[PDB]
Amino acid sequence: AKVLCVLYDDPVDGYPKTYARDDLPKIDHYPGGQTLPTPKAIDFTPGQLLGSVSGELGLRKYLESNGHTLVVTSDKDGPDSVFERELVDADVVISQPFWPAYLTPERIAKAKNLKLALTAGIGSDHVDLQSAIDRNVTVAEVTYCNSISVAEHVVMMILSLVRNYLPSHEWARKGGWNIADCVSHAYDLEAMHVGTVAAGRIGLAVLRRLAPFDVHLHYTDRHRLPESVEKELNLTWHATREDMYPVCDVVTLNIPLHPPTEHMINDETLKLFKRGAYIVNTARGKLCDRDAVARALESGRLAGYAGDVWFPQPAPKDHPWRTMPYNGMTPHISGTTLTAQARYAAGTREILECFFEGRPIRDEYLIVQ
Amino acid sequence: AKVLCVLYDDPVDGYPKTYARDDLPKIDHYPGGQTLPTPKAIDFTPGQLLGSVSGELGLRKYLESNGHTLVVTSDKDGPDSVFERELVDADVVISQPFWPAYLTPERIAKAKNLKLALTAGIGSDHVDLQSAIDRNVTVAEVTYCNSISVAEHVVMMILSLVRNYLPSHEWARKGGWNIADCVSHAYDLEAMHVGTVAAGRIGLAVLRRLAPFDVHLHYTDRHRLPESVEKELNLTWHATREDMYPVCDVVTLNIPLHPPTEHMINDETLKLFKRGAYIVNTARGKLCDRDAVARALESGRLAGYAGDVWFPQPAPKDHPWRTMPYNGMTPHISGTTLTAQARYAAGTREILECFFEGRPIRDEYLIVQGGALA
Secondary structure (H helix, E strand, O other), X not given: OEEEEEOEOOOOOOOOOOOOOOOOOOOOEOXXXXXXXXXXXXXXXXXXXXXXXXXXXXXXXXXXHOOOEEEEEXXXXXXXXXXXXXXXXOOEEEEEOOEOOOEOHHHHHHOOOOOEEEEOOOOOOOEOHHHXXXXXXXXXXXXXXXXXXXXXXXXXXHHHHHOOHHHHHHHHHOOOOOHHHHHOOOOOOOOOEEEEOOOOHHHHHHHHHHHHHOOEEEEEOOOXXXXXXXXXXXXXXXXXXHXXXXXXXXXXXXXXXXXXXXXXXXXHHHOOOOOOEEEEEXXXXXXXXXXXXXXXXXXXXXXXXXXXXXXXXXXOOOOHHHOOXXXXXXXXXXXXXXXXXXXXHHHHHHHHHHHHHOOOOOHHHEEEO | OEEEEEOEOOOOOOOOOOOOOOOOOOOOEOOOOOEOOOOOOOOOOXXXXXXXXXXXXXXXXXXXXXXXXXXXXXXXOOOOOHHHHHHHHOOEEEEEOOEOOOXXXXXXXXXXXXXXXXXXXXXXXXXXXXXXXXXXXXXXXXXXXXXXXXXXXXXXXXXXXXXXXXXXXHHHHOOOOOHHHHHOOOOOOOOOEEXXXXXXXXXXXXXXXXXXXXXXXXXXXXXXXOHHHHHHOOOEEEOOXXXXXXXXXXXXXXXXXXXXXXXXXXXXXXXXXXXXXXXXEOOOHHHEOHHHHHHHXXXXXXXXXXXXXXXXXXXXXXXXXXXXOXXXXXXXXXXXXXXXXXXXXXXXXXXXXXXXXXXXXXXXXXXXXXXXXX
């Protein structure tokens, strides 16, 4: 079989030769009991850079020793890309949401041999699901592989925005001291009201991490959490997002993007936020009207905005979120720490082993089959 | 009476005329039950910049309307400085640990009228306690006023070092994307081993905040915490610092500075650390040998270092911790957020009211009174 694997570029200084640490913490399961991936074997050392082109998700030696071909590329966009040319006879397509190889209906139509569309990561927004089903393409993901990674990123950003960490660090880096300049925009997080717009795997993990900071926790969702969880975390539930915003000092968005949520944060709804509110958004960039957020930070409606998701993605060099006041942006990276990469590289191998050996892929990995 | 109050400078663009928010969250007590300050009144709006010279800790109207004198200055060092000149007849001296007016034995000797040395903040590191005892000077602090503020700072820095936040943010700020450059030094915190070198008010608050990140918690201290605390946080106890280091992915220092802890982190003890360990230090800069930390980050013995305390302080412009690899430094600010300032400005007034009215100052505020009776 032919495996076509799209990954992002190596570091500018080249694929790393050394790493900061020698191993990764051992984890038995995810919250709720799902076990971590169980491939028969791995050809990588957990902690290596696996999601760049030279990392190959540690797949080459398993595939080639079993008679398969592996084509790795970062050239994924447009009809002229390496991905599009190799797609026509690829049996398996693999990519990460952090550098996604889109499986449009047009591409699925030309992918005459396509049997498996594998997300090395979470989700399937880059895959046209009905076209995949109609063509008997299996679509699978490494469920839960980086939900905790994103939640850590969220809480880190909440703390950094509220305490004015990033300008403070710049004063130190540039040789200043400037105590009053650091803290004239700096507060404690303690006893603030924090709300999450969804409470799935990420949102729940965020709520649990926020609780011992003694904040007042709010959330909105379609499904209320179990009453025992609301009670142990002292949660206030809101039926609508609009009912939650006016009471929150901090709002974190952990909800999927669809037309009814596209630009749900705009000039009109920002009017509902407390003056000086903070927003953290690691879900999707298009949840926020780009220029409305920037306008809210210029006026002081918001006291900070941070996240790792942008529209468009990758963000152009001139994207205004890069330089607007009191931003805590990073590039799209939260779920591709070396820790998360080890999990979803192992999960990718587990799925491939099942697929090639004719054994069932985990139910929780399957999206459509 | 004459009150001499040393504060840090206003922002370079001037004292702020607006603030990012309109009020502060309400908090009833500190962990363990100590109530927040209870002055009879305050002449400031909580959230204002109170620890700079123009903020005056909100004290001027209260002191002057009661016949007192108030001198506020940031000019605190040297024989011609405002502080040294006004010290000779001051009844009360107030300063913050973030810009401390040192009360050495020599200065206390020259302060002919000194009756009260008030820390607008926590501690008394800048005050010679024996001189205060010998001269019957009361020494007081606004206990607990920013212990939580520092703990937040610590966990924020732990997350930022582990996940490589600060270089990642700059790739974004500078117009890049560079996913692999961001994450080739980036990990999750989950299930790492984190140890604190003391577990007092700050260290315990750090442990509680770290627990739901599903890390493995370690600590050492002079005495063990109550078993009920160890169990609820699943703590591993270590009798010595040296026994704790080799097992920790992250070590946070929350211990006071004394001769036995000076340079406790050095080229020799760093050999005990896991390769790629992270250190966060909001206690005092001289706990860590300056160049040993820088050497450990160049070699990879440490994968990151962050904190807000430096040696010396203020850090000179060329201080190597400012630019060494994988640092998360800030200036000395963790316990002077606007939130903490409201608490210790209120606490400062409460103590002053008691002192001038001849009412007892809270036992928990007292460091010295006649003798070292906290």
